[PDB]
Amino acid sequence: ALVEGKIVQCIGAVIDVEFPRESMPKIYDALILEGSELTLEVQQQLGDGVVRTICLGALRRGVVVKNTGNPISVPVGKPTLGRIMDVLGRPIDEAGPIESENKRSIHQKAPAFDELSPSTELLETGIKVIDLICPFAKGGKVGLFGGAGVGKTVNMMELINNIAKEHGGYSVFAGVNDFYHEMKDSNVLDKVALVYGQMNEPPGNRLRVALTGLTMAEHFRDEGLDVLFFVDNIYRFTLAGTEVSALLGRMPSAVGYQPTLAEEMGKLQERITSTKKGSITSVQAVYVPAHLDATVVLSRDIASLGIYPAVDPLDSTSRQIDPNVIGEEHYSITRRVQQTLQRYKELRDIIAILGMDELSPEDKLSVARARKIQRFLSQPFHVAEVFTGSPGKYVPLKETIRGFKMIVDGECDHLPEQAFYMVGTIDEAFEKAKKI
Ligand code: NA
């Protein structure tokens, strides 16, 4: 037997349901219906025996439902890798069941204070421009800003690739055949678990999509791993609003009022952190038409110039650019690199108006060095090997720093600029120069 209840009012997916005074559901209990795929989840004690719930999926006044007495639990771990699941952890890729010995509740306490990693550490991506200009912290929150055509997906895929290859980590994607086949075709699919919501659904369901993704990321973290959690257009293509209307959209709660979706998401952020065991670092894709720690800004203009990845090395940002976190040398090189690029930008019209021979000795050096910097920021990607034929490169942070230091210190002033294009370490630039 399961304790039973009758629906009182439906006003959207919010479904107030009445239960015996003798047996009230607790917050987060999942209620089910004989013969329906739908699940209702308890949010609130309204009082006098009623609970407010949200319906997950697609119920008239007076219909009877059962309390399971348990929250929603989803399969976690390695059997989720390479699979596409829905918000309740059911397979939607038609590849059959997900057989795991481990399941986890989608609602979890944040880690206790003594489980938190005391100090800030970089998550090394192996991607020169990110590690130099907008370095990620383990447990940090990254924004990836870009329109279409600018490699947004390629960059996500390479990050998935590199964290698995070099650090033994995994990724989880929470979003809403296309992306899927890209990852099979680039062989990163087996390194990432996917959870999809749906277009046209209410904004509060998006919270649950993110909660399911996060709970999966947390299992991998508990295996002692560094994990990437990708969230793609999670406030977009909803029923009730736009993006910003979805954010201030209220929902039912046990907290003493109805908090915003923007407010329930902030609580989810508490679980994105670095612990003594491992870390979860989030990457939120933000769609641009022409509490973050780092912003990766993709630009059509950099891509026009033939530079991939098309990261704007002056408009991208990171709070980790701080000598106390990255050391004096890394901080200094990042800064000198940006000053040289900025100086070149400033000289752009004078080079046009009054010619390159009109520049002073020092300004000629700045231009030459800026151009070589722009080229050394380009990088062949492992996930383009399928398309292009050339091997991708993973560049350790020590080498990124050494390479760029050599350029600003003037120890590469004798190499031609073409030699710095589409290589890895600076030693590859020297080798490439010998053939040019
Ligand atoms: Na030169």
Report all structural domains of the chain as residue ranges with CATH numbers, in order of start: 1-71 (2.40.10.170), 72-320 (3.40.50.300), 321-436 (1.10.1140.10)
Residue 104: how many CB atoms within 10 A of its CB?
22
Tokens 């107030």 belong to residue:
16
Q: Using CA atoms, how far apart are residues 333 and 335, in angstroms rounded to an integer?
A: 5
Q: Regarding beta strands 294-297 and 317-318, do their DSSP bridges make them parallel or antiparallel, or are they unpaired?
A: antiparallel
Whether 7 contacts 68, CB under 8 Å: no
Nearest to 10 by CA among 68, 50, 70: 50
Q: How far is the CA of 342 from the centre of ligand 1 (A)?
A: 19
DSSP string for 38-82: -EEEEEEEEETTEEEEEEE----TT-EEEE-SS--EEE-SGGGTT
Rounded to 5°, angle at Cα 415 from 410 and 417: 100
Spatial contact of 433 and 416, defined as CB atoms under 8 Å apart: yes
DSSP symbols for 211-257: HHHHHHHHHHHHTT-EEEEEEESTTSSBSS--SHHHHH-B---SSSS
Closest to 144 in 3D by CA, of 317, 338, 321, 383: 317
How far apart CA 132 and CA 125 sit, in angstroms, is: 10
Annotated binding site: 146-153
Residues 6+ positions from 208 with CB-CB distance below 8 Å: 41, 54, 56, 72, 87, 106, 197
How close is the Cα of 374 to the center of ligand 1, in Å? Answer: 15
**Which residues make Cβ contacts (< 8 Å) with residue 179, sequence separation at least 6?**
153
- Ligand 1 center–CA 365 separation, angstroms: 8
* 313 torsion bin: left (phi>0), alpha (psi -120 to 50), beta (else): alpha
Neighbours of 63 (CB within 10 A): 14
Tokens representing 2 are: 């399961």
Q: If you measure from the C-alpha of residue 190 to the centroid of ligand 1, how many angstroms do you get, rounded to a whole number?
A: 45
Which of 125, 275, 161 shows the shortest CA–CA distance to 134? 125
The Å distance, Cα 310 to ligand 1 centre, comes to 25
CA atoms within 13 A on the CB side of 373: 33
Partnered with residue 318 across adjacent β-strands are 294
Which residue blocks in 279-383 are alpha helix, DSSP H? 300-304, 323-326, 328-346, 348-354, 361-376
DSSP assignment string, 355-401:
-STTS-HHHHHHHHHHHHHHHHT----GGGHHHH-SPP----HHHHH
Return the SS3 of 199.
coil
One-letter amino acid for residue 73 of the chain: S
CA of 416 to the centre of ligand 1 (A): 7
CB atoms near residue 396 (< 10 Å) = 14
CA distance 87 to 72: 10
Q: Ligand 1: distance of its center to the CA of 420 in Å?
A: 13
Distance 169 CA to ligand 1 centre (A): 42
Where is the chain discontinuous (C–N over 2.5 Å), named by the preceding residue?
58, 176, 290
Residue with tokens 């004078």: 350
Element (H, E) at 12: none
Q: Which tokens in the block code for residue 239? A: 């029923």
- Listing DSSP states for 120-187 in one string gives --EE--S-HHHHHHSPEETT-EEEEEE-SSS-HHHHHHHHHHHHHHHH--EEEEEE--HHHHHHHHTT
From the list 32, 259, 312, the residue with the least C-alpha distance to 151 is 312
Residues pairing with 41 in the sheet: 30, 54
Cα–Cα dist 97/83, whole Å: 10
Which residues are annotated binding-site positions for ATP? 146-153
* Ligand 1 midpoint to CA 288 (Å): 38
SS3 112: coil
Q: Report the alpha-carbon distance of residue 355 to residue 432 in Å, rounded.
A: 30
CA dihedral (16, 21, 26, 31) positive or negative: negative
DSSP letter assigned to residue 251: -
Q: From the CA of 367, how far away is ligand 1's center (Å)?
A: 10
Give SS3 for 236: coil
CA atoms within 13 A on the CB side of 301: 8
Alpha carbons 141 and 45: distance in angstroms, whole number: 33
Amino acid occupying residue 60: R
Tell me how far apart the alpha carbons of residues 240 and 250 are, in angstroms, rounded to a whole number: 11
Experimental determination technique: X-ray
Contacts of 73 (CB under 8 A, 6+ apart): 89, 103, 104, 105, 106
Q: Which two tokens stand for residue 25?
A: 């559901």
Measured in angstroms, how far is the CA atom of residue 395 from the centroid of ligand 1? 25
Distance 381 CA to ligand 1 centre (A): 28
Three-class secondary structure of residue 308 per DSSP = coil
CA–centroid distance, residue 134 to ligand 1 (Å) = 28
Cis-peptide, bond into residue 309, ω within 30° of zero: yes
Report the C-alpha gap between 408 and 360 in whole angstroms.
18
Q: Residue 382 has which token pair?
A: 């492992």
Residue 18 buriedness (CB in 10 A; 0-12 / 13-18 / 19+) = middle
Q: What is the dihedral of CA 51, 57, 59, 61, to 10 degrees?
A: 30
Distance CA 2, CA 364 (A): 79
Pairing of strands 4-10, 226-232: unpaired
The residue type at 230 = F
Ligand 1 centroid vs 369 CA: distance in angstroms? 8
Cβ(284)–Cβ(302) below 8 Å: no
Q: Is-contact 5 64, C-beta < 8 A?
A: yes
Of 208, 133, 53, 192, which is closest to residue 374 (Cα–Cα)? 133
